[PDB]
Ligand binder design. Sequence first.
Ligand SMILES: Nc1nc2c(ncn2[C@@H]2O[C@H](COP(=O)(O)OP(=O)(O)OP(=O)(O)O)[C@@H](O)[C@H]2O)c(=O)[nH]1
Ligand SMILES: [Mg+2]
Ligand SMILES: [Pb+2]
Ligand SMILES: [Pb+2]
Ligand SMILES: [Pb+2]
Ligand SMILES: [Pb+2]
Lengths: 309, 166
Amino acid sequence: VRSVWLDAFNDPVAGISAYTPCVHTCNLFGDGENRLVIADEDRKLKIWKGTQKASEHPLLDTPVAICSYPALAVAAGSHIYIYRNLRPYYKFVLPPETVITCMDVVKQAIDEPDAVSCLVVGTESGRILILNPAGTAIVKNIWVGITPAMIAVQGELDVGYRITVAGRDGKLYHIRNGELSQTIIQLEAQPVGLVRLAKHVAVGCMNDVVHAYTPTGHKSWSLYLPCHILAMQRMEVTGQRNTKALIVALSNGEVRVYNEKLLVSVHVSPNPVTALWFGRYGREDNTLLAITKSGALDIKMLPRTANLE
Amino acid sequence: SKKVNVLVVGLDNSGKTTIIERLKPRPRQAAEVAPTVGFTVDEVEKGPLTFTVFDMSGAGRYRTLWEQYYREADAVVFVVDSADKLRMVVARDEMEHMLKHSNMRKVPILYFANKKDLPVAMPPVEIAQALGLDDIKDRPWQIVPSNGLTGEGVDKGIDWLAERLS
Ligand SMILES: Nc1nc2c(ncn2[C@@H]2O[C@H](COP(=O)(O)OP(=O)(O)OP(=O)(O)O)[C@@H](O)[C@H]2O)c(=O)[nH]1
Ligand SMILES: [Mg+2]
Ligand SMILES: [Pb+2]
Ligand SMILES: [Pb+2]
Ligand SMILES: [Pb+2]
Ligand SMILES: [Pb+2]
C-alpha cells in the first residue's frame, strides 16, 4: 500500500559496494550497541557504528560473504579468516583440494539470539560443513552432488534443524537433521535469493517470481513481480506482532515487504538496493539497512505500533 | 507544599534515570546508575512544589507502559541522547504517540537535549528540528541541553518547568 517504515538516516556518499551476503550486523564490542559489518569490493572491510564510519580495514582477497558466531568470519577462496573482537585469530581451511560459494550460521542449542552458534559452509566441491561451536573443528560433513549457490538455515542444531540448498542447476535440495532429504524441487529459472520464512522457504527465480516451498515440496504461494529481483531478505519481527516477512528489492528501485503472501509495505530508494539487512543495529531492534547500487547507506526502522497483520 | 506529577520518558539509554539523580541531594545520589527495570517512582522537592517523579524504561519492551501514566501526568520531561542521531526519528515517533494519546493532557513538556558533553552531540536547534518541536503549538514546551553526569543544565530545565507549574 504505502511505506510502513520510519526514515532513520541516510548517507548518499558512503563508499559501500556489497551485495546481500557481505553485509551483516552483530555485537562485536559487546556493549549492546550493534555495528554494521561490510566486506566491500574495495577488498576492504568497512565498519559502521551508529551513523558514521568507525574503521576501514584491508582484506587479503575480495570476499564471498561474512557472518558471525562474537567473531566476524570472512570467507574467500579456501581460507576463512576468523577475526574476533576484532583482531585476527584463525585461518581455518577446507581439507581437500576446495572453494567456498556460500556461508551461514546454525544455532547450537538455544535457538535464541546471542546463543552458541556454529559456522556453516558450502564448498563448490559439493559438501556442507557444520563446525564446532568454537569454529576450530568440522562437526558434520554432508556430501550432496550439486554446486551450492545460496543456503538458508532454519532451526536449532541439537533440537532439530533443516537447511534448504539452492543449487546452481536450478534445483532445491533439503537437509533435515543432518540427513539429506530425497525431495528435490525443479525451479523454474535460476535462483537469485533464498529466505527462511515461517513455515516454508522462499526462492526468487531469475524470471521475477518468488516461490514459497514446503520441505515436503508444496507450493504455498507465488509472488509475481513487476521488475527484476536484486535482493531478498528475511524480516523477523518478534513480540506481539510476531511475523516472519519477506523483503524484496527490485531494480526498478522499490523495496517491498510481504507478510507471507500479502504486500505490506513498499518504498522506493533513489537507487536500486543491492544489499538488504534487517536486524538490530544501534539500539533499535527492527532496522532496515540498505546499500544502494550508488554506494549509499540507507537506514530505516519499523515503528513500534506498525501493523503487518 | 503543592504536589505535582512529572512523567519522565524518552528513549532507552538517554539519561532519564541519571538526570533525576542530579535532582537528589548530593549524599543521596547514586554512584553508578543502572538500566532502569520496568519503572520507578521517586520524589523530589523543589521550592513550594513537590515533584512525584515517574522514571520509566525506554526499552523497546517497556515503552508500552508510559500510557499507563499519561492520564495523571501534570508535566513531562522528554529525554534525548544528543549523540544518538540514529534513533532520532524513533524518539520522534514515540513523542508523537504520546502527544496524540487521548490520556496525555496539554501539560508542559521539557525536552532535555541530554549528553551535551559528547563530541558528536546534536545541537538543541538541530534536535528540535528532528522531533519537530516547532509544530507543537498548544503546550508550554522548552528544549534545554544538559549534562546529566554533572547536572549541568538540569537546574536550568527543572526551574523552567516549575515556573509553568505555579
Ligand atoms: N557522556 C554522558 N553520559 C551520560 C549522560 N547521562 C547519562 N550518561 C550515561 O549513559 C548511560 C545512560 O544511562 P541511563 O541514565 O540509565 O539511561 P536512561 O535515560 O535512564 O534510560 P533507561 O535505560 O530506560 O534507564 C549511563 O552510562 C549514564 O550514566 C550525559 O549527560 N553525558
Ligand atoms: Mg531510566
Ligand atoms: Pb562483497
Ligand atoms: Pb551473513
Ligand atoms: Pb520463480
Ligand atoms: Pb536552580
